[PDB]
Structure formats: C-alpha cells, structure tokens
Design a binder for these strands. Sequence first.
RNA 1: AGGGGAUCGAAGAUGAUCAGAUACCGUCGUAGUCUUAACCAUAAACUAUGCCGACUAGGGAUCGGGUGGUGUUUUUUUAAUGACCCACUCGGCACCUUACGAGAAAUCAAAGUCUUUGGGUUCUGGGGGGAGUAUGGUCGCAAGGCUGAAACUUAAAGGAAUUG
Lengths: 87, 81, 25, 216, 97, 129, 96, 121, 206
Amino acid sequence: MENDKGQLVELYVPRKCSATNRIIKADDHASVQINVAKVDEEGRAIPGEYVTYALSGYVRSRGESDDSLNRLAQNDGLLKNVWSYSR
Amino acid sequence: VLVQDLLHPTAASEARKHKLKTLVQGPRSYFLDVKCPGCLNITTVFSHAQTAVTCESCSTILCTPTGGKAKLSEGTSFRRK
Amino acid sequence: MRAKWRKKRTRRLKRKRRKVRARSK
Amino acid sequence: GWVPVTKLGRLVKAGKITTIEEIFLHSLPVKEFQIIDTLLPGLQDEVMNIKPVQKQTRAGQRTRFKAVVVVGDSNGHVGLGIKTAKEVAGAIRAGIIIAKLSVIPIRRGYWGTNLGQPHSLATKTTGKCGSVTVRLIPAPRGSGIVASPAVKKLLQLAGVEDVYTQSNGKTRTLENTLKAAFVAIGNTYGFLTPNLWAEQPLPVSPLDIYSDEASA
Amino acid sequence: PKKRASNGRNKKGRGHVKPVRCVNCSKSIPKDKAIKRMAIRNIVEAAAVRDLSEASVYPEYALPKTYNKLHYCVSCAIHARIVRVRSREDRKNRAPP
Amino acid sequence: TRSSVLADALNAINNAEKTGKRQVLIRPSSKVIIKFLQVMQKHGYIGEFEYIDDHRSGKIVVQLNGRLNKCGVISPRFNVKIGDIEKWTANLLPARQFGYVILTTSAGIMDHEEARRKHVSGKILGFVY
Amino acid sequence: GKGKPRGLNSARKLRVHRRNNRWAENNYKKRLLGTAFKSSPFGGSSHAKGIVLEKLGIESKQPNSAIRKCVRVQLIKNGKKVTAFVPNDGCLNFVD
Amino acid sequence: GRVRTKTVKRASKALIERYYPKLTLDFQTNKRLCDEIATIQSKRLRNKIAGYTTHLMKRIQKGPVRGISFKLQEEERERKDQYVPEVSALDLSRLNVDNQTSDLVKSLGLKLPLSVINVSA
Amino acid sequence: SLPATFDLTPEDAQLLLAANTHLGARNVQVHQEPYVFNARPDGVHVINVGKTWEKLVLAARIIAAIPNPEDVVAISSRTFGQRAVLKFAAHTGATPIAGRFTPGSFTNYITRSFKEPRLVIVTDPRSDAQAIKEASYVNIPVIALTDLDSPSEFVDVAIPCNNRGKHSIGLIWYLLAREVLRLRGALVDRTQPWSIMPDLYFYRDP
RNA sequence: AGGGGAUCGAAGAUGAUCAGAUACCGUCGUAGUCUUAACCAUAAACUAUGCCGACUAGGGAUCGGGUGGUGUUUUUUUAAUGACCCACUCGGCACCUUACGAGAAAUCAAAGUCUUUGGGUUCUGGGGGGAGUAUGGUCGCAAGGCUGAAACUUAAAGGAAUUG
Ligand SMILES: [Mg+2]
Ligand SMILES: [Mg+2]
Ligand SMILES: [Mg+2]
Ligand SMILES: [Mg+2]
Ligand SMILES: [Mg+2]
Ligand SMILES: [Mg+2]
Ligand SMILES: [Mg+2]
Ligand SMILES: [Mg+2]
Ligand SMILES: [Mg+2]
Ligand SMILES: [Mg+2]
Ligand SMILES: [Mg+2]
Ligand SMILES: [Mg+2]
C-alpha cells in the first residue's frame, strides 16, 4: 500500500499464481517458476529471454499444474491444439 | 480441470449424461411411424409404450410394454418421426 | 463393583423399602 | 569464517542479494542461519520459557529442556524457534538458529485515514495450533498491543504497535499459543486485498541472473 | 478408542445376523463375526495312501476327500495358532496368506 | 428442502473459489442472486457471468477471477437500522478500507457504502470480500 | 443449522431454552433456590455471633499431621451449632 | 562365528578398488603384499584382510561382485555400453497400425505406409 | 511462436509408432489426462502422438532455458530408463541419478549426494515419488514422462508416453536429448537426422 | 391364561476341583425355550454419529432398473428373448488412495465448506460423587417404566496418544 502522500509502504509486494491469481507466500516451498525459452527464426534459443510462469503450491499439490500450464502455454502462442477449452 | 466451457459442453459429453443433468434437460425418447401390415393406416407410437398399442382398423398388435423402450412387433417397418 | 450389580443391589433395596412402607399404609 | 555450501549462501557473500525481501519475493528456502545474520543484523532474540520434558526408562527418567525463543528486528520481521536439549544453555543457543531460519514478514496496515507509518495490521488474521486459536484485529492509534505478556512481546518484536487479540483453547500451553500467533502474523501476506489486485511482470529469480556465482 | 472400522465383523446393512455356534467351545457368535475355515483333506493320509492302494480292489480307486466348514470364536481362534494377533498396520490387510 | 437459493448460490461460489476454479454453475438462478452477483461484479470480485434460460428457473455460469476471498449470506435477514450498519460492518468485515455488507433496502439491493450515501437501510442479505 | 433455531420469529424458543438450561449452573441454581436463606447456617450474612460451647482438637487431613484447635459455637440468631476455627499460633487461650 | 567386521571388509574392498592389476588369488602372496601397500598396526588384522582379499578375488573371477569397481571392469563395462545393432530395430522391416491408430495418422495430416490389421474383443 | 519447422516430420512419426509410444494404459484412466485419442478395442487407449510431440518440444525449450546445463537432473529408478538417463547426461550436462535416490538429496544440505537443480526430469512419477516429493520442498520444477494412469501431483509439463515398453521409454529420452541439443545450437541443422543411433538409449538384459 | 413340551437349560440336585468353591468342568434337571390371546416398552435398541437440502478429490468392484454396441454362446447355423462382454447412466450396501479441509488425537468424503464464526429444524449436556437415589405424581397384574431432587462430600474424575 501507501500512505496519504505517495511514499509507498508495505514492503515486498508479492507474486501471484498465474493459474489462480493467488499470492505465493514466502514460505510456500511447493510453488515453482517455469522459464521457457524463445526462438528467433533459427530454432536456437536466445539466452536470457524467457516466458515466465509461476504456479502456486496449491495447484501443484492437486495434480492440476500440468493441465494449467497447457492452457497457459497455448494462449501465449508457444503451444498448439493439445489443449481445448471445451472438455 | 479448473477451467472449461461450462456453456458449450461437447455433444459427446451431453450424450452420456443423464437427461436431467444436461445443460438444459430434455427427453431422450421419440415417436415412430409404424407400418402395420395390410392397410396403410399409419400409426404413431411412443418410444416407451406402457400399453399394447394397436391399429385403428386391424387391432392385433403394434408394440408391447416393457420396463424401458417398447418392443415392436415381429413383422413391422418403422421410421423415427 | 460392577454397574450391573449395583443396579441389581439397588433394585432389591427398593423392593424392601416398598414393602416395609406398606406395613403402615 | 562461514564458507557456506548453498547457492543462496554463495549469493550473499558475493553481495548479489542485499535485501531479505528479495528472498521473500522468490520464496527461496533458507538453510543457513548466517544468511539471516548477514541480511538482518538488527534482530533481537529472547526466551519466553524453559520447560522440562522427561522420558520414562528402565532406570529413572531422562530429563530434557524445551527452549522457546523468538527472534526478529522491531521492523517487520519475526522468527520462532523451538528446540530440546539435555542442557538449558545448549537448547537456547540451538533455539536461536531455528528461530532465525523461520523469519517471516508481517504486513502492517492502517485502521483508517492512512496518515503514514502503518501502525497496525491490514486485515483480520487468525492462526490455530493444536487447540489454541489466536485472533488479531487492527486497532486504532495509541491502543497498544492488547495481548497477554507472552503474545504481546512477540508482537512487539514484529513492529506492530496497535492490535487487538482474542484467544481460545488451552492458552496456558505456551508453545502452542506462540505457534498459533506465529501463523496469524505470517498469514498477513497470504490475504489478497484490493490494493494488491494489480498485475506484475513476474521478475526473474536471482538464482538465474547470477548463475556464474553458483557452485560450478 | 475404536480399534477397527468394521469393529469385529462384516455387518453393514444387516441389523441382525442369526449367530452360529463355535465348533470348539460351543460359544455363540454372529456368523459374519465368525472366523470360518474350510477343511478339505484326503480320506486317509499322505502316509496311508501307500498301504491302502495295494490292499484295495478297484486299483487306484478314487482317493476321496472330506469336506468340512469350521467356525471358531475370537477366543478359540487365537488359542489355536490361527489369526492370533497382528500389528496396527498389519491389521488392515484382508488378503489371505 | 431448499430453504434459501442465495446460500446455495454463494456456497457454491465459495467452494469453487477455494479450489481455484475459473467458473461455476449456479442453480436455480433467482432474481436476488443476479442482484447480489451484480454488486460483486461491479466491484470486480467475480467478473462476467451468464444466465442460462431453461424454462423452469434458470441457471447461472459465473466466471470467477481469483480476487474473491469469501462471499456469504446472513440468515435470517435481520432488520438493520441506519445506525446499526457500523455494527455489522465491524463484526464480519476484514478491515475498514475494503469489504461490503450487501443489504436489501427499499431502494434496491446495494452495499453498505452506497446505502450510507443514500441514507437508507433495510434488511441484511450478506457480505463480500 | 448447527442446532438452535435461526428463524426471525424464534425468539421464544431461544429464550425458553436458555431459561431451562440455566438450572445446570451452580450459581444460578443456588441463588434462585435460596439455599443461603434456608441453609448455610448464616442467614446469608457475612458475619455472625454466637456462644462457645466446647474446645475441639480436630485432627487435620492427609497428608498432614497436626491438631487444629477449633471451637464449637451456637449461633445467637438461629440456634445452630457450628464449628469455627481460631486462626493464629496460641489464640485458643483467649477463647476459653 | 567367522563373520568378519567392517574393518576387515572395508579395507579388503578398498584394496581391490585400486589394486586389481596387482595381488593374485593366493593368500601367501596376498599377505606378503598387503603389508607392503598398506600399514596395519597388528598381524592378526593384516592376516584377516589378506584372507578376505583372497576370498573376494575368487568371487571376481566368476562374474562381477556388487559394490566392487576396479580399473579393469569399469572400462570393460563401459566399453560394451556403446554397443548398437545394425538391424535398426526402429527401422521398418516391411508398419502395422490398428484401425484406431490409422485414424490418428490422417488426423495429424501425415502420410505413412500402413498395413491395417483389425483387432477385436 | 514457432517457425513452423518444429512440426511432426513424417520420419518422427515412424519412430514413435514403430516404438509403440502411442499404446497407453488400459481402461484405468486418470481424469488429468486428456491426451487419450480414440480408445482402441481390447481396452488399450491410443495416445495422441501429436500432443506428445508438442509437449515434448515445450519440455525441451524449458531445459534449454536453464543457464547451466549441470543444473538439470535426470532421475530414473526403473530398469528400462537407467541406461537412457545416463546417455542423456552424456550429450548434455544434465547431472544424472540412475538407481536409488537416497532420500535427502535435495534437503539435508550436508549430505554427500546433495544436489541443487533448477529442474528435475523423471521417467515414472509412480516409482520416482521420493524424488518428486523432495522437489516440492525446495521449489524445484519437475518434468515427467507420464503414462495415461500415472499420478500427476507436483508434476509440471509432462510427456505422454508408453512407460510400459522399453522401446517407448528410451525413444523419448533419445528425442528429448536431440531437441535440447538443437535448441542450444550444437546440432546446426534442424533437418539433420542426428546420425547417433536411436537404439543408443535402449536397455539390454544380459 | 390354554396348547405343546423333542432339544438346550436361570433354579435345584449331584460328582469333581479347591484352604474354602453355594463358581468356572461333569451328570441330571424345573421354569423357560415353541405356539395362540393379552401384557411388559427395556438393550453396548451402536454407525456409541438426529432429519431434510446444496457444494467440494480421485478408483475399481458389486446389487436393482434403463440405454447403446453388425459384440460371444444356446433355439430354428440363423431372429426376438436368456445368460455373458464392452461403454454410459440413475438409485443402494459398502470399499481403496490422498489430505484441499477438519480434529486433542485416534481418525473423518464427512466428524469437510466452523474466529473469513449464520441453509432449515428437533433433541440433549454444563467438574467428580451422593444419584438415576429419596420424595410426589403417572403407567403396569407384577417385575418395573417415565418424570425426578436435596442435604452432604470432594480437587480433581475423565478423553486420545507418548516412553517405560
Ligand atoms: Mg478458556
Ligand atoms: Mg482398549
Ligand atoms: Mg418469517
Ligand atoms: Mg491434596
Ligand atoms: Mg435407553
Ligand atoms: Mg438393536
Ligand atoms: Mg454404482
Ligand atoms: Mg449397473
Ligand atoms: Mg443396498
Ligand atoms: Mg459448568
Ligand atoms: Mg455434572
Ligand atoms: Mg486412556
């Protein structure tokens, strides 16, 4: 947050899970952060460039991490018809 | 699954589900056009009879009641209406 | 003692107290 | 000398990590207590109580002492550690290493009209350990920490000045009461609030930018 | 505390089971709770077969068998080198040896 | 039997949001369910939702963003006086800066913040945060 | 429903249920039944006066081995005989 | 009993770990050589190590021994690790795809040589 | 996106089908596996190899995105994947773990076998649960080769394959190595066949 | 209160054991056990878990009904049925895994959606004894059932797990 005159307070604004919009707490050890590489016209990965996906430990514990990343990766252009909205 | 189109289920899934548990419930029965031998006298029967339906002119047999779908006669032509 | 036989002991006692009290009315 | 053996420990000596919130942001596990000492040198420790636990054996009872120690600077960080040892001094020393490894941030907020310097908790929070339930409610200015002396000074070391408290269960169990309060304060950052609804670019973990300073 | 989920027996939706008598001590025990064992043995022995063959007309007769269903109570089974006692985690296994 | 259809509507939303589901189906889609949902969506707590018109009562498919923490009904619907809203706001809202005690008044269904502006109170329906 | 009625017209059931259930409270039961007025040899009063009738050497319970030096007093206002303690070292000599 | 302790066993295994192209299957040579490559504070222990080394050498002569890796067997075991066939078991010898698999082939927009054989319950 | 040269080539579908990578498990099915395609008679479910390939490429992109090759860890306890992981670590940094896992290789920072990987690759989640369980303690992503009945808890992007057969297990390890090398640029030509024989990653019983 | 009364068998009689043994073991054996008409109204009558309603994780099996499949076998190779196999489904008795969650724990798919405390409703409890006792009612032929205290006394009784 912040006080009446700018001066942002509440240090450490935390991350939110990509698949659930849920805060990844500082003690969540099941949560992971996936980095997937990019390619430029040659099939060679560009070092230092990633599409980053953060998943909370709740979905990973429920077995829905794999499915949620299929939806997440398909709609970012780096995947294909493996995932379908209509189940 | 945590995400899915609950508004447009596939026709395969709606086919398997119970009639009351589809997106909008509807009957899975139908009506037939029975070709009784002899006179044309086309008769309409339900998929589930609950009664021994017989033709108006020659009322021998057209279908027999059953726990589920009605059983048509041995010699008979039919088309779903 | 067993709760079963404390139930039995008290019932016998209530028999007599229902009988000695009948000697007066 | 420290000579750590951990990827996170190597980054601390290299100086690539300067704020402990950078550890909190990426949920990096802490397995070496010198990381907390290097990042947070201003934390203070104190022991609530020492109690003897005894094991029945073929020849007499085996007495050991349980040490409950709370660490943390008075600005936004606390850690709670519990350890048993056959000596009281050894348990207290070992109960400080555990306490530092579990340092967590507290989300402070205002009871209203945010003039500045958050003086209370942002939201209602609760923590349950065993039968003990500890509830914390934001309080106006000057009301202090309305709590029992054991719970109060844990909140004093958290940087919270004004708060209300309600307790349940066998609160005379000091170990579970502090564990229930430690859960409640840690939950202040797990509660999503409308001012945190904004999206973020999901920054890259420091373990990738500084991979050259790893073990290999 | 509750030792077992079934609590001794196989009664879930029966109400009453109309018990049977123990074959060793005549104790009454509900049939589901009983420890039924089936005893199927040859008519003579594994040792008398050698002498009952040549001393028999109708060579290789049948070697017939005896069939008997035995019921034991909880006490009679434990005392007879049967289902005696297991550990807390071994108690949950229902597979025969 | 079904006593209140709003409780089943809100409990299904809570159970859906606990698992992380982006959507949930609500039956049988009363009016006050729509009015309650419209307030939640006005403040950005649910998002889009869809009404399915079967001929009996209707169904609702609600798209759920991850912003919602708890929606609940208050049963019975107590009569809330104008000065007692601060009491209800105090008991069952997380903080003084966010959260709405949705109550039904003669001027439609609206949260306590809008009720204060209009200076009108009524019966309490529920809460959202 | 977690037990108790919640209906907005269920005030009588809740009020009567609480009234019936308060009789399990020792203080509520003792106060309304008037046990202090009809028992507890005082008349519900803090102090009372009487006449010493005997000097008693009541022996303490276990684990404890001593003699307590109590007295037997008959209340003036009621006439009931009660036992009272004479607390201090050597104060039984003033209450002959 | 004649069960040998870890001191007899670990030392015997360590010698074999690095002295295979060395001391043979004979105890007399074994004990005359172990005291030259390793120092032991007592003769009784030095005899047990040489006796167990002789015993473990014989087990090596007939197949490998689990937990023992000397210079000669690790290079031989890795030498056969690159062995590859010439038939190319994944290469086509004629492929047989069932009816359901045949539906997969054309669905992906790919043409393959297929010999469909029906399979039924 | 992709330059559209990463699609399933006709020769790739030869190896997948000749190795029977498309033959999934029996009617026992997990709801977390929509990769099933047109269940065959006799109960066998045919896996959509088109989904296997695209998922396999996604796994390879993640492996090539890790700054250090040695921070990848390949774990296989099954006897059919013990050879495959070792040679996967022959052509890639990918520090391997073949055989037992030694519970405490990711926690217990003082242990001899301590490793700190940024990604873990496992063959069978069911038999490799100990590796998967500890990865949930130190914020480590996990890539698995999941059959149609394999568990999917704490498992990130997974490659649907046939873990029952030895031909399918080794082929996926062979494939994954080939694409990660291509993404890194070691294999200069995308259309090159990588003459290294696919039966290199294939277990031998003697 | 009639009928019936084989078997087993409160009581009782006996043999034995025992320091004693009016018990356990053995042999007899009355009431009872069985039935008809009428009472009794209890039980660890237990799932020690009130009823109605909604939602929340996976898996197989089974019972009843239904649907589909050129599916297998018997009639009349051949149809329909019947019995099996595969898929789905509604309802039931349960079962396996896990812990999102709950619990003091044992454990629990409900004993979950309960300090982020409210779907509807019924009943019961308020430290351990005295005590389910006294007394007064009411029901029963009786045995007894239901309702049900107080004086007094006490600092612990009690639940689940831990190590001996
Ligand atoms: Mg209390
Ligand atoms: Mg017991
Ligand atoms: Mg009303
Ligand atoms: Mg005492
Ligand atoms: Mg009763
Ligand atoms: Mg019963
Ligand atoms: Mg069923
Ligand atoms: Mg069925
Ligand atoms: Mg049933
Ligand atoms: Mg009380
Ligand atoms: Mg009481
Ligand atoms: Mg106990």
